[PDB]
Amino acid sequence: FNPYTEFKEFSRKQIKDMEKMFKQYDAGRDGFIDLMELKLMMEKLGAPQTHLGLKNMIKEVDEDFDSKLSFRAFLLIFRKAAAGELQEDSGLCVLARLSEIDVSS
Ligand SMILES: [Ca+2]
């Protein structure tokens, strides 16, 4: 898929930064962040989430029904963040905040 045409609100630098973080936490190297990998990510960032909380984070952006996060789903988190669509202090809000990738340009 082409992230550059699908997510025109982000510069190529920003998309590559997001790719850097995505790859860092896809420990399995399969191109997805699954529930267990996302559990570890939230722990490492210092904001651990419950079983079902993590499932709901994935559900919110998993528009392709992978039951895990593709890179498209990951970018969608930042799109929702940048557009004010995430619930205040929700798991996805916290992920985007603690990622250190600034989308509040
Ligand atoms: Ca993976």
Residue numbers in the entry: 80 to 184
Quote the original article.
EFhd2/Swiprosin-1 (EFhd2) is a cytoskeletal Ca2+-binding protein identified in human immune, brain and mast cells. EFhd2 and EFhd1 consist of a disordered N-terminal region followed by two EF-hands and a coiled-coil domain at the C-terminus. We also reported previously that the EF-hands of EFhd2 are involved directly in F-actin bundling in a Ca2+-dependent manner and the coiled-coil domain is essential to the F-actin bundling activity by homodimerisation. Based on the experimental results, we propose that the F-actin bundling activity of EFhd2 depends on structural rigidity conferred by binding of two Ca2+ ions to the EF-hand domains.
We failed to determine the structure of the apo form of EFhd2 owing to structural instability during protein purification; however, we could determine the crystal structures of CDEFhd2 mutants defective for one Ca2+-binding site (E116A for EF1, CDEFhd2EF1; E152A for EF2, CDEFhd2EF2). The overall structures of these two mutants in the presence of Ca2+ are similar to that of Ca2+-bound CDEFhd2 (CDEFhd2EF1, root mean square deviation (RMSD) = 0.34 Å for 102 Cα atoms; CDEFhd2EF2, RMSD = 0.61 Å for 105 Cα atoms), which implies a single Ca2+-loaded EF-hand is sufficient to maintain a stable fold. Although the crystal structures of EF-hand mutants (CDEFhd2EF1 and CDEFhd2EF2) are similar to Ca2+-bound CDEFhd2, we observed structural flexibility in the Ca2+-binding loop of EF1 and the C-terminal linker. Furthermore, comparison of the crystallographic B-factors between Ca2+-bound and EF-hand mutant structures showed that the largest changes in B-factor values were for CDEFhd2EF1 (35.6 Å2), CDEFhd2 (20.4 Å2) and CDEFhd2EF2 (21.5 Å2). To evaluate the effect of Ca2+ on structural dynamics of EFhd2 at the atomic level, we performed ensemble refinement for CDEFhd2, CDEFhd2EF1 and CDEFhd2EF2 using Phenix.ensemble refinement. In addition, CDEFhd2EF2 also showed a moderate degree of mobility. Interestingly, the C-terminal linker (residues, 176–184) followed by the LM-helix also showed significant RMSF increases in CDEFhd2EF1 and CDEFhd2EF2. Even depletion of one Ca2+ site in a two Ca2+-binding protein showed a dramatic reduction in F-actin bundling activity to a level that is similar to that of previously reported data for a two Ca2+-depleted state26.
